[PDB]
Amino acid sequence: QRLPLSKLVLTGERHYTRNDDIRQSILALGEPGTFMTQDVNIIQTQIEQRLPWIKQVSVRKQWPDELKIHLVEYVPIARWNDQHMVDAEGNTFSVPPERTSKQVLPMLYGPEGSANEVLQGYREMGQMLAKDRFTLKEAAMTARRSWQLTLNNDIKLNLGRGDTMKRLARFVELYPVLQQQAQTDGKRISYVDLRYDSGAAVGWAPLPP
Amino acid sequence: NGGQEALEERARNELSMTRPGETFYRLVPDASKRA
Ligand SMILES: [Mg+2]
Ligand SMILES: [Mg+2]
């Protein structure tokens, strides 16, 4: 008959961690059996590598028989360049796509190191847009620093390189007119392209049947 | 150079050119379609 000898207790809010992932970290280590002597700090520096979604690992031991591991995961705000994530402060990490993956998370895009930059804009435009009835599905910065936002609809907004808060300002002012014209013709606004002092060019599309 | 994007960025901003099919709205003060 089986019953435990070394116990393992995990604490803190955890969405992306399976309990087995920590177990597999300690066990897949060296000299398995030196289990509450293998340095409490070495076990931090092992949970951290094997899991890039842990912000922090807090390991102590409680004599006689248990190992108490406190975890803080990275809370992502966006899906960066399709294959990473990012949290409020700009930190980029990853997860298995085997994991939740049916998340209502926006997706940011941009050059290699620009995940904090893109986050900046994503906050500043998502803010003003949510001040009206609009949420950001995507937001893509190019190398040249030209922003293109896909919206809650599949309405893309090409804001170019310049007066961006002025330009999606101008879109919010216009949206009613666009919706009116959108039905009196029975087409959906595909994009509105704002690279104009004072102007906007709208491309329309047919609509799902 | 910028290629096809910096060319298009310019044509819109400096010339107010559009693409085939797009409706244009200017805001010399108020919104206004081609009409
Ligand atoms: Mg900005
Ligand atoms: Mg521009």
Author numbering:
A (entry chain A): 4 to 212
B (entry chain B): 272 to 306
From the paper:
Bacterial cell division is a fundamental process that results in the physical separation of a mother cell into two daughter cells and involves a set of proteins known as the divisome. Early and late components are linked by the FtsQBL complex, which is well-conserved among bacteria. The FtsQBL complex may have a structural role as a scaffold in the assembly of the divisome since FtsB and FtsL proteins are recruited to the divisome by FtsQ and the resulting FtsQBL complex then recruits late divisome components. In this study, we have determined the crystal structure of the periplasmic domain of FtsQ in complex with C-terminal fragment of FtsB, showing that the C-terminal region of FtsB is a key binding region of FtsQ.
To gain further insights into structural organization of the FtsQB complex, we determined the 2.9-Å resolution structure of FtsQ50–276 bound to FtsB25–103. The electron density map of residues 25–60 was not observed for FtsB25–103, while nearly all sequences of FtsQ50–276 were found to be ordered with the exception of N- and C-terminal flexible regions (residues 50–52 and 262–276, respectively). The overall structure of FtsQ50–276 consists of two domains, α and β, and the β-domain is responsible for FtsB25–103 binding. The solvent-accessible surface area buried at the interface between FtsQ and FtsB was 1330 Å2, approximately 20% of the monomer surface area of FtsQ. The FtsB sequence (residues 61–95) folds into one α-helix (α3) and one β-strand (β1). The α-helix-turn-β-strand motif begins with the α-helix (residues 64–75), followed by a kinked loop (residues 76–82), a short β-strand (residues 83–85), and another terminal kinked loop (residues 86–95); the two kinked loops contain two proline residues (Pro80 and Pro89). The kinked loop between the α-helix (residues 64–75) and β-strand (residues 83–85) wraps around the Tyr248 residue of FtsQ. To stabilize the kinked loop conformation, four FtsB residues (Glu68, Arg72, Arg79, and Glu82) form a cluster with extensive salt-bridge networks. Interestingly, the β-strand of FtsB makes a continuous β-sheet with that of FtsQ by anti-parallel stacking with β12. The charge reversal mutations E69R, R72E, and E82R of FtsB nearly abolished binding to FtsQ. This highlights the role of FtsQ Tyr248 and the FtsB α-helix-turn-β-strand motif as affinity determinants.
